[PDB]
Write a protein that binds this ligand. Structure first.
Ligand SMILES: Nc1ncnc2c1ncn2[C@@H]1O[C@H](CSCC[C@H](N)C(=O)O)[C@@H](O)[C@H]1O
Ligand SMILES: Nc1ncnc2c1ncn2[C@@H]1O[C@H](CSCC[C@H](N)C(=O)O)[C@@H](O)[C@H]1O
Ligand SMILES: Nc1nc2cccc(O)c2[nH]1
Ligand SMILES: Nc1nc2cccc(O)c2[nH]1
Lengths: 268, 257
């Protein structure tokens, strides 16, 4: 059928996306409490840390797809990639990342995430060093639209193809349905070299979340749907794990039921 | 001694626990070295019990970071009221407290139990039952009817004895004095300046007895200790700051036998 109408709804909805509210809802406590090892924050960081710890995910260039105003997803990654591209649809998110890169006080504070990353990576690294490295390795912050066949546009800055991709809570949150999801997955997969790796994190069985005024629509997906989409896009699934959101982390900022983390290698 | 009546806790903290000496990023620094001696010792699981006393705490808490998870009853001490007030400010999370969070974080980092620094500080604050006045120069340093559970299962002291003793003999006696507080079989963890003769604390200028590693060893033996571990950290040039003339730092793990 027609993809344009659905995409236009999404783009419209995100014009009301408020980065601060979003940061507060997802990365401040209770969800942003990293003290409980059973929490979602620690689980995510652990998936990322353990994956990079295999040494199997490395190279020169990495691209973060739909970064938003967050950086936690790149904390463990930055030690393995000299060149990191961050990306987002919204200018206001790109600016938010701009505040953090300039180490402004106005910026969101990721230090609890940085510290927790250093802690689980087990190298005795101090968080200030972790943060300094990330800031050094982010070579550009780019506009992106995963719905376009060339999500970064034509003749764009990013070194292509990238050795690896990271994406957290993007696809399912900008895709009106499973078919749009699959197409978005196919588009970003063009940015990854063959043999490259994708690290994918997202909400399971979610239909909405709040970002200030904006109550945005999410395509509820299942683990098996995520798995099939990855296979469909030409990936071997190396790892796919599920975190079940505990009742007390269900706070009415969304209707998420769980979080998935996928490690996939693009067949080449 | 009367010199300690000019001792400024904020200036002391600033001089020794703010950068450069307070920068914990470089693993080769003295801060990380100290935390490591503490951490590694307790990790052995051989230094355990219910009660512990920190001798001459001053306005600092780093020395108990790893210790607090092995002892449910912790007593902190210092000769100066101003230091006891400063500790309380951090213990009660009052305003103007010193920020020990960099130290808490590195303790968690070093211990490697994936503990968050807020939990660490929470546990310490919880287990410190009391902050008592003390004079190591007295044969009963805590006094007659001290609220402190005696004898203690273990003792900790950092940069005290050598810093309040005019000379080696005085040093030795102060060690004998505190040793009476320690249950036989108990453990003492002792940290201090090596070959130091003075250090500043704002308007106060304190005299120190310059001691060597083997001098410390001998003193522990004489006091009735078996020396389990004794290590030295040589002070790098960039950590020589004009606030003292320390040459090194020692760590001793001693068991009362
Ligand atoms: N068409 C599109 N293509 C790529 N990203 C889009 C997009 N439309 C919206 N987005 C972005 O999708 C993001 C989802 S929120 C996820 C933020 C971040 N990655 C984290 O892990 O929390 C928002 O930043 C939003 O601006
Ligand atoms: N007669 C005495 N008996 C016990 N402590 C004394 C003392 N005279 C001075 N002190 C204290 O000894 C401390 C030395 S500085 C050490 C402070 C802290 N333990 C640290 O590791 O940094 C000061 O706090 C000082 O007030
Ligand atoms: N965007 C986003 N949605 C989430 C749902 C659960 C936990 C998280 O950290 C999330 N981040
Ligand atoms: N009192 C005191 N605390 C110290 C910490 C590190 C190095 C030193 O020389 C110190 N002296």
């Amino acid at each position: 059928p027609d993809s344009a109408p659905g995409q236009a709804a999404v783009a419209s909805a995100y014009q009301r996306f408020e980065p601060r509210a979003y940061l507060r809802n997802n990365y401040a406590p209770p969800r942003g409490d990293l003290c409980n090892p059973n929490g979602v924050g620690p689980w995510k960081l652990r998936c990322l840390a353990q994956t990079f710890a295999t040494g199997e995910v490395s190279g020169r260039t990495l691209i973060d797809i739909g970064s938003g105003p967050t950086v936690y997803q790149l904390l463990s990654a930055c030690s393995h990639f000299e060149d990191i591209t961050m990306t987002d649809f919204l200018e206001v998110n790109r600016q938010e990342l701009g505040r953090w890169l300039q180490e402004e006080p106005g910026a969101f504070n990721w230090s609890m995430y940085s510290q927790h990353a250093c802690l689980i990576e087990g190298k005795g690294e101090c968080w200030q060093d972790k943060e300094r490295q990330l800031r050094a390795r982010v070579k550009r912050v780019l506009p992106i639209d995963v719905h376009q066949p060339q999500p970064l546009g034509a003749g764009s800055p990013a070194p292509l193809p990238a050795d690896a991709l990271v994406s957290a809570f993007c696809l399912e949150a900008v895709s009106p349905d499973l078919a749009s999801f699959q197409r978005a997955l196919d588009h970003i997969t063009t940015l990854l070299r063959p043999g490259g790796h994708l690290l994918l994190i997202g909400a399971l069985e979610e239909s909405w979340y709040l970002a200030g005024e904006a109550r945005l629509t999410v395509v509820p997906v299942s683990e098996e749907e995520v798995r099939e989409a990855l296979v469909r896009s030409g990936y071997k699934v190396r790892d796919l794990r599920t975190y079940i959101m505990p009742a007390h982390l269900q706070t009415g900022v969304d209707d998420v039921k769980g979080v998935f983390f996928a490690w996939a290698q693009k067949v080449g």
